[PDB]
Amino acid sequence: MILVFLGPPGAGKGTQAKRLAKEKGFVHISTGDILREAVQKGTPLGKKAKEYMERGELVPDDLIIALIEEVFPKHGNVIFDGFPRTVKQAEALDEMLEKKGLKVDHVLLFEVPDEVVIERLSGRRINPETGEVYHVKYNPPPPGVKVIQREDDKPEVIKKRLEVYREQTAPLIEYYKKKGILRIIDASKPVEEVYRQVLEVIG
Ligand SMILES: Nc1ncnc2c1ncn2[C@@H]1O[C@H](COP(=O)(O)OP(=O)(O)O)[C@@H](O)[C@H]1O
Ligand SMILES: Nc1ncnc2c1ncn2[C@@H]1O[C@H](COP(=O)(O)OP(=O)(O)O)[C@@H](O)[C@H]1O
């Protein structure tokens, strides 16, 4: 089974993908997590990607498509979390999968309004020791636990990221709807309720 989680930044895709991977054994492929690691390590990918991410822009397709080929697992169920983000990426994914005898089985669209996106992103915090993700209101870090705020979660970069989502990523809704594999998730609900909906959709 291959899943794609699609939706605006802050919708809760990483939160749900992490949970699903941990409990049900999916391979979690987060392009964001992988890129942030590349940047921190200063790899050729990381050095090239870094400034796109800093500015809230998408990293060029060729680099991301190569990254996906590098990390796609030989066996196992997969959650694509934050990939594809463009039509070209989606077309490449279909082609890659077909060569492996696979296909995207479900695309889960995490619907949330812009007001919620901003609330979610502005309050997002990370434990730099473990990578655990918190929210200042909805899931605060334990007392005494040091956390950081991503530079791309600052107000002006959130704005750009949302514009980029609407311009480049949103056309994937129709792309996958035409293939009949798009499932709607009401991502505005609490984490537990969203998770039950994810489980229901994937059966
Ligand atoms: N259903 C939810 N309700 C409230 N807060 C959430 C929910 N899902 C995620 N969050 C919080 O919102 C922020 C964004 O979640 P995240 O999973 O990182 O979104 P995405 O990967 O779609 O960008 C995080 O701070 C997370 O703790
Ligand atoms: N599939 C992709 N294609 C191009 N750029 C990407 C992709 N995934 C992640 N990025 C880059 O990494 C940044 C952070 O992505 P991500 O962690 O997925 O954001 P969010 O937490 O909002 O889902 C993006 O704003 C973009 O610059």
Swiss-Prot record:
One of its GO terms (biological process) is nucleoside diphosphate metabolic process. The keyword Cytoplasm applies. It holds the Pfam family ADK. ATP binds at G10, A11, G12, K13, G14, T15, R120, R124, V133, Y134, K189. Its main location: cytoplasm. Pathway: Purine metabolism; AMP biosynthesis via salvage pathway; AMP from ADP: step 1/1. Its EC number is 2.7.4.3. Residues 30-59 are annotated as: NMP. It catalyses: AMP + ATP = 2 ADP. Transmembrane segments: none annotated. InterPro entries: Adenyl_kin_sub, Adenylat/UMP-CMP_kin, Adenylat_kinase_CS, ADK_active_lid_dom_sf, P-loop_NTPase. One of its GO terms (molecular function) is nucleoside diphosphate kinase activity. AMP binds at T31, E57, L58, V59, G82, F83, P84, R85, Q89, R161. One of its GO terms (cellular component) is cytoplasm. Residues 123-153 are annotated as: LID. Keywords: ATP-binding, Cytoplasm, Kinase, Nucleotide biosynthesis, Nucleotide-binding, Transferase. Monomer. Belongs to the adenylate kinase family. Consists of three domains, a large central CORE domain and two small peripheral domains, NMPbind and LID, which undergo movements during catalysis. The LID domain closes over the site of phosphoryl transfer upon ATP binding. Assembling and dissambling the active center during each catalytic cycle provides an effective means to prevent ATP hydrolysis. Catalyzes the reversible transfer of the terminal phosphate group between ATP and AMP. Plays an important role in cellular energy homeostasis and in adenine nucleotide metabolism. This is Adenylate kinase. It comes from Aquifex aeolicus (strain VF5).
